[PDB]
Design a protein around this ligand. Structure first.
Ligand code: UTA
Ligand code: UTA
Ligand code: UTA
Ligand code: CLM
Ligand code: CLM
Ligand code: CLM
Ligand code: ZN
Ligand code: ZN
Lengths: 212, 213, 213
């Protein structure tokens, strides 16, 4: 569930109106995450790369209100917590589906939740096997077959859609660092450059930290 | 060219097609670096030039995959049997470009005959479309050889039902022991997922690493 | 300021202007790295700070090229004699930004006078546009100094007839013995092709590598 944001006392109330109504826009930015440390943490564990990245991304998002915003009854709200909606691939059809699972700050509980959803739905070729996407969501996708330096979604109508869209590519070694490309796409009504940078820098810190 | 009506009812992506055509219309771009170390070395011995060879290889990779030859015709999904490249050419005298097309052939020598013929007839014409209207069965290829980029994205005001891939290359540059060509690929999500764009780029990489004859 | 009414009928891009304004309305972004190794050394013997110097050099390069100073005014294409930078200013206390403008000068010292004056008058003002309406003859410049990026693109719902370039710079980063500044340039294709954007980036690179004094 959610709270109504106090727009009238917000430092960004002018910006919110401006980028929602006067100059509606968002932006994407693609950055490399250094996963050198994370790969060492992983290689010494039983967790898999994609669910760990999902967990760390969702953890970072759940720290920052402006990454959990939405419009409900034409008012700005903030979800208390958001769950990741992530894509999965079906090699037999060469199609993908979107699944979600409950976020938990505990990585072991997260992994339980994830592996359970995968067990039930990993072969289901419906686009949305679980039915309606949780309203409190953040979108995560990977393209593990190719490296990219840039990714951008051209959406014909993004009116009042404020959930961040995160896309990863195939990681690759670049000199002395193992680098994961990560695109983050937001609506400027709720996120400026500073908030996106804060998110990325926090995710980088999480990748460089003990997993638990 | 010739086309066939696609069987959407029996398509594994039937649901995705409706979703990304009607519910959430969108496409995406991505920019990837192609390793052209082997190609540049191959081209050192070739009668043919870098840009027309890249056009040929891009067109060959596109022609391999049905989802990169899709269109709406008469408000139904079709697949072109084959698509022809429409490429941009620069005019040094005016600092303007034109778009030319030529018939695709899987045989590089025949392609280059076709390419040279179009260039001979039209290369000095400063009209945007010297040949008249773009053939319906087309891909778009452009080069920006004057600057290296890591990103390129087209912001198109109305891309409704436009499914032909748009390919843009930057100035190549050396990165450690490889020569890398930045290549941007922009598609519509109704017909192409990340898998299909990745498959295209990786196939193109294979073709760049292939013998020219 | 002063502007001229552009002769579209005798323009070499008459047909491109029509095409990308009306037939296929679009623009593009592209992100490139600027080598600021020389500039950074230049600034180690200067009182001038990195951000205003970059504003100056970007504005200087834009002011050299007519196609980066275009607009629609009284429903016709015009060229501004000169454009002034509108730049984003960050307020650390609130973690919000404002947009400020100051007059462009070809003299770096006068430009810095102009910049420091506006900062003194308005740096504590949290309004988005403290000075009032953006000057009609403007260029937009933003910094995003907190994170390095290789791509940046603005997804603008309606960009009809907006021809002023949008320039965005990231956190600079050391790569070997080069210090690289990511720079995104986003234009309308009606007034700028790949050639002009490349020409702008390369000119900026040349200015960064030149004496400031
Ligand atoms: C947004 C947007 O897309 O706008 C741009 C619109 N498009 C245009 O303006 C058209 C641009 N096209 C061109 O300039 C030319 O068609 C192009 C790419 C230079 C090819 O010219 P061309 O037919 O004479 O054939 P090429 O031999 O391939 O090119 C001439 C030289 O440029 C070199 N070259 C071609 N493409 C590239 C590249 N991407 N990076 C670096 N060098 C290049 C090529 O290797 C050759 O070099 P050398 O002489 O050292 O061997
Ligand atoms: C436009 C757009 O967004 O389209 C994409 C649409 N989405 C899709 O098509 C779904 C793509 N997703 C997938 O393919 C799978 O979810 C994905 C990413 C491979 C994860 O699969 P998985 O859940 O079985 O779990 P993982 O162990 O993390 O991944 C499987 C393997 O790939 C490796 N891997 C996963 N992600 C990456 C990556 N980004 N780069 C390099 N290697 C990777 C991982 O190391 C493991 O290989 P090894 O066992 O040999 O070490
Ligand atoms: O969407 C984004 C919306 N736009 C924004 O929010 C506005 C962003 N703007 C800003 O944060 C500031 O206006 C900006 C760029 C930091 C310049 O302000 P300022 O000139 O007072 O600079 P300072 O706070 O004094 O910072 C100075 C230090 O930061 C450094 N710096 C400035 N820009 C950059 C950059 N792009 N990359 C790395 N370091 C930088 C600068 O070189 C100096 O360090 P050194 O002394 O070693 O050289
Ligand atoms: O469509 C989705 N994912 C795709 C996968 O390629 C993509 O990441 C995307 C995400 C969000 C989106 N949006 O909200 O506009 C559009 C595409 C989810 Cl809505 Cl299932
Ligand atoms: O306009 C074209 N090419 C430009 C050159 O900058 C660009 O590559 C482009 C391609 C396709 C396009 N579209 O289909 O939306 C828009 C721009 C061709 Cl359609 Cl002529
Ligand atoms: O909105 C502005 N700047 C933002 C900062 O994130 C961005 O650089 C931007 C610039 C121009 C623009 N436009 O003209 O469509 C949209 C966003 C200025 Cl108009 Cl104040
Ligand atoms: Zn309003
Ligand atoms: Zn018209």
């Amino acid at each position: 569930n959610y709270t109504k944001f106090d727009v009238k006392n917000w430092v960004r109330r002018e910006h919110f109106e401006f980028y929602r109504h006067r100059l509606p826009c968002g932006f994407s930015l693609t950055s490399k995450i250094d996963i050198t440390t994370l790969k060492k943490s992983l290689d010494d564990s039983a967790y898999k790369f994609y669910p760990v990245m999902i967990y760390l991304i969702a953890q970072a998002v759940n720290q920052f209100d402006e990454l959990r915003m939405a419009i409900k009854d034409d008012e700005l709200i903030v979800w208390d917590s958001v769950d990741p909606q992530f894509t999965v691939f079906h090699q037999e059809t060469e199609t993908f589906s979107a699944l979600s699972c409950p976020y938990s700050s505990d990585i072991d509980q997260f992994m339980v939740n994830y592996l359970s959803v995968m067990e039930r739905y990993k072969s289901d070729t419906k686009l949305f096997p679980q039915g309606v996407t949780p309203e409190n969501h953040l979108n995560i996708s990977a393209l593990p077959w190719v490296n990219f330096d840039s990714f951008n979604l051209n959406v014909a109508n993004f009116t009042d859609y404020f959930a961040p869209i995160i896309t990863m590519a195939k990681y690759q070694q670049e000199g002395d660092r193992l680098l994961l490309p990560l695109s983050v796409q937001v609506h400027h009504a709720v996120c400026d450059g500073f908030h996106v940078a804060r998110f990325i820098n926090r995710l980088q810190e999480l990748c460089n930290s003990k997993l638990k």
